[PDB]
Amino acid sequence: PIELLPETPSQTAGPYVHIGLALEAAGNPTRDQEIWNRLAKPDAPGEHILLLGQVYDGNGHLVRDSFLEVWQADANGEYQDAYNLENAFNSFGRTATTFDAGEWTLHTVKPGVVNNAAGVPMAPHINISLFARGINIHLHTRLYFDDEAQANAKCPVLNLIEQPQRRETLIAKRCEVDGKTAYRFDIRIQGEGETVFFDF
């Protein structure tokens, strides 16, 4: 068979990832422009929501040094790749869990529908990559919404998960934080109710 150049191997982000990717959190002075947790400006079209969650290890303890990256379509189901702080909406964002509470937050808008390669629509979703000390290679996951049941039932991606019970782990729960619509998405890295992680 044929062989290409081998991909550079992954290594954990380490506990100090924040010095490099989340300056504020490291408790260091930031630069003029930083990629953070606010994907949408108040004036962005779509339904404004707040995403929040916690990360748990195999022993049920909080992972307080986790780093997350998100990739989602805008309200119209369009990926906005040109990253710019001037934008009313950016498809890309970053967040991290607090050393205290151990909770991450993201301010965005509910994503519109996008079709898969075969032209089938996928339920609204947010792509997530999780990094942290103890994680040799980042974990891929998807955040789906509990109020999109009809859509969720038909998602070609969700349907690849063999066991229906495991699909439930990818569904964020609707709630309200300061009277604002929010969705809670907890990540269980290992054990009971362990979140589905993807390979692509």
Binding site: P6, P9, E69, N84, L85
Partner: protein, 233 residues
């Protein structure tokens, strides 16, 4: 917006470190027990952000001036970013972070007794050029003792984050320095099973790129997943 034009070479999960690598204690509780669920590539996975328009500061890539001059071995870290096919990755975001010359990080949580350097921060970022080249200027970090085994020391290393064209290519890794005796001893390094893969993470001394009577240089090229056009789909 972005579009589903590309397909990426499937990752070799046998080349990269496995999730569970017991010598590296923290991985025990932070590794899934269920198998990853393979999914076909779609627009969600084949696209990613473009940082061309991000407002980069003048010294974003110069750790020697971006934070008095720092104490330590002045070095330039340069190299190129290509894909599995050898194709360069222009205008990609490269971010790096490290400890100081003594092995102390400018982070709340770091309690190592080595002192902070009043003139050193430890963060750099830059975009690769049309040829996929990047370059940074910093000081060579020192080894760092950590709570793993009773006497574990991380080899001198720099943390790297590279975006690439999609979220599918995004990578976080670490650079090690040629000849460091600590390398072969590290449980983090050893998370990687193939010694050939370990070799990919060692930057080689680059005398040709050094600035005489000024600073030395290290070469570190990074390879991201191969990008091909779809066919007969």
């Amino acid at each position: 917006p972005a579009q589903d034009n590309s397909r990426f070479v499937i990752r070799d999960r046998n080349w990269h470190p496995k999730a569970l690598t017991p010598d590296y204690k923290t991985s025990i509780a932070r590794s899934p027990r269920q198998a990853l669920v393979s999914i076909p590539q779609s627009i969600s996975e084949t696209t990613g952000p473009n940082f061309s328009h991000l407002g980069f500061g003048a010294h974003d890539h110069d750790l020697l001036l971006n934070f008095g001059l720092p104490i330590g071995e002045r070095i330039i870290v340069a190299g190129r970013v290509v894909d599995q096919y050898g194709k360069p990755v222009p205008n990609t975001l490269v971010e790096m972070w490290q400890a100081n010359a003594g092995g102390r990080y400018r982070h709340k949580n770091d309690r190592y007794l080595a002192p902070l350097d009043p003139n050193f921060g430890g963060v750099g970022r830059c975009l690769t050029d049309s040829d996929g080249y990047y370059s940074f200027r910093t000081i060579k970090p020192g080894p760092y003792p950590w709570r793993n085994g009773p006497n574990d020391w991380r080899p001198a290393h720099i943390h790297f984050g590279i975006s690439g064209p999609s979220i599918a290519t995004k990578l976080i890794t670490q650079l090690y320095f040629e000849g460091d005796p600590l390398i072969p001893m590290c449980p983090i390094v050893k998370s990687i099973a193939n010694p050939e893969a370990v070799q990919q993470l060692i930057a080689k001394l680059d005398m040709n790129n050094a600035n005489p009577m000024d600073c030395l240089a290290y070469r570190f090229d990074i390879v991201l997943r191969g990008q091909r056009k779809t066919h007969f789909e």
